[PDB]
Design a binder for this molecule. Structure first.
Ligand code: A1IQ3
Ligand code: A1IQ3
Lengths: 263, 260
């Protein structure tokens, strides 16, 4: 379909656009987590005592611990949504689709993209926080009370599987675009121009993975298989989030997040 | 720079401007002058309702709000078109990534205004890739703040269009605006001004050859370019009040974010 030079051109454009949209890249994330650096070294939060020390050193709040951590996640999810929305507008064709479908695409795409990109901040042991100045261990989160502990762990369960593919940012730039331009989102009005955009992005992705991971067979297929998984991990996330917002009146959802979930 | 090099640079920008922008000034002017397949005319409430049904808008979920949202939709599309075109300006893509973002951030409004003049005459503006034409008098007549939000763009376009620039003139003009070294927060001004000096040389030579009878056309066009600065700040002020006064103009949070 599209000539190789044209698909590579699209790859560069999306990567270029991804760097400009997302503050904390996967390459930076790994430089912080992989050490051999004194300047990019994170403060590690692994228990109540180090959390309290963390509020002074890192500088990110009268509520309980698990709530405070939850709002720190959602604050960051909200910014991600803003960041993903800005990235979407740079995808060729996105801003020319029917305005209703843009909203529909973001509405159903932002959560899947957040999980994908949260994996970049994670290893088996914890997650980068506060633009990489902090690092909160998996076990500390898992140990949070009532429902909140099991609300945090599935994000890690995914990331460990997802990071095994060993993608870099230039791969993620195309993958993330493919997710947004899904024609099977409920309630879309013109599936066809959305599918046309995704076809080029898929072509661009396949070529990119072949070139950047030549010794890695069927990475395309393996990467697409993870992409539909996200559908269920997301609804399972919304399931827990719905039950949480039943017990907890001290949770406030952000209006941006709120509207995404009314649907 | 050698004269041949300025002509090559002018040609490169024109060729690129044609690939980036769907509806050129020459196509627009054939349509507005009855020299072409006639556009649907929106001149009042009743023709507006017929027009969204015939013309088929993509902005469509009060009247003045909906027209406002169609302007916003089209501006967002323009921003991506200008962004693509920028990558074709020699040297742009080698600048620091942050400075690229800063230049586009402040340049898009001035270019949108400038290029909107291409779609306008004294009596209205082309919409929907030239298939429609919405009259100035209808736009001026919209209620509360919206009427006076629309008219200043026409007041600019009429003055700007008196310079009678073509697409090959504009192709360089737009490049010069983008490569403004005085944008707030730039990290490395020197290569931005170095490129703008080249663009300015090419513009000066372009205007002399394409408008030999037009003395100080260069100077007059640079004067408009700085006008754009204040016209844009007045625009963003009104634009801020609209998405602030009209709380129903802060509709869906997603939509709000799309138009942040
Ligand atoms: C300052 O305190 C902190 C403490 C721990 C972790 C972090 C940073 O966490 C993130 C960082 C980024 C980013 O920077 O890209 C994106 C997403 C999350 C994140 N979000 N999230 C949701 O539950 C979530 C999600 Cl996925 C989507 C929508 C809404 C929500 C919500 F509202 F319900 F929260 C997590 C659950 C568990 C974990 Cl470990 C991490 C997360 C900060
Ligand atoms: C029902 O649908 C329509 C009704 C009327 C006109 C149009 C097409 O209008 C355009 C076409 C093109 C293009 O295709 O090149 C570029 C810019 C505008 C446009 N933008 N604009 C802004 O206010 C504006 C500006 Cl200048 C710069 C940045 C941001 C904004 C914004 F966000 F606030 F909108 C206008 C105000 C009045 C008018 Cl008459 C026209 C415009 C469609």
């Amino acid at each position: 379909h599209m000539e190789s030079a044209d698909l590579r051109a699209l790859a560069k454009h999306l990567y270029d656009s991804y760097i400009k949209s997302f503050p904390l890249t996967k390459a930076k994330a790994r430089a912080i987590l992989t050490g051999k650096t004194t300047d990019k070294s994170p403060f590690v939060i692994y228990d109540m005592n180090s959390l309290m020390m963390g509020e002074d050193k890192i500088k990110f709040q009268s509520k309980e611990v698990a709530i405070r951590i939850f709002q720190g996640c959602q604050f960051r999810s909200v910014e991600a949504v803003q960041e993903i929305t800005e990235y979407a507008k740079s995808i060729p064709g996105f801003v020319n689709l029917d305005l209703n479908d843009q909203v529909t695409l973001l509405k159903y795409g932002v959560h899947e993209i957040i999980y994908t990109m949260l994996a970049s901040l994670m290893n088996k042991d914890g997650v980068l926080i506060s633009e990489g100045q902090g690092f909160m261990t998996r076990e500390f989160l898992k140990s949070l009370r009532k429902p909140f502990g099991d609300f945090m762990e599935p994000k890690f369960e995914f990331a460990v599987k997802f990071n095994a593919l060993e993608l870099d940012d230039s791969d993620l730039a195309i993958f993330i675009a493919v997710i947004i331009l899904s024609g099977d989102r409920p309630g879309l009005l013109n599936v066809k121009p959305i599918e046309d955009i995704q076809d080029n992005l898929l072509q661009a992705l396949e070529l990119q993975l072949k070139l950047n991971h030549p010794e890695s067979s069927q990475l395309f297929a393996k990467l697409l298989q993870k992409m539909t998984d996200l559908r269920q991990i997301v609804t399972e996330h919304v399931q827990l989030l719905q039950v949480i917002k039943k017990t907890e009146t001290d949770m406030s959802l952000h209006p941006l997040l709120q509207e995404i979930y009314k649907d």
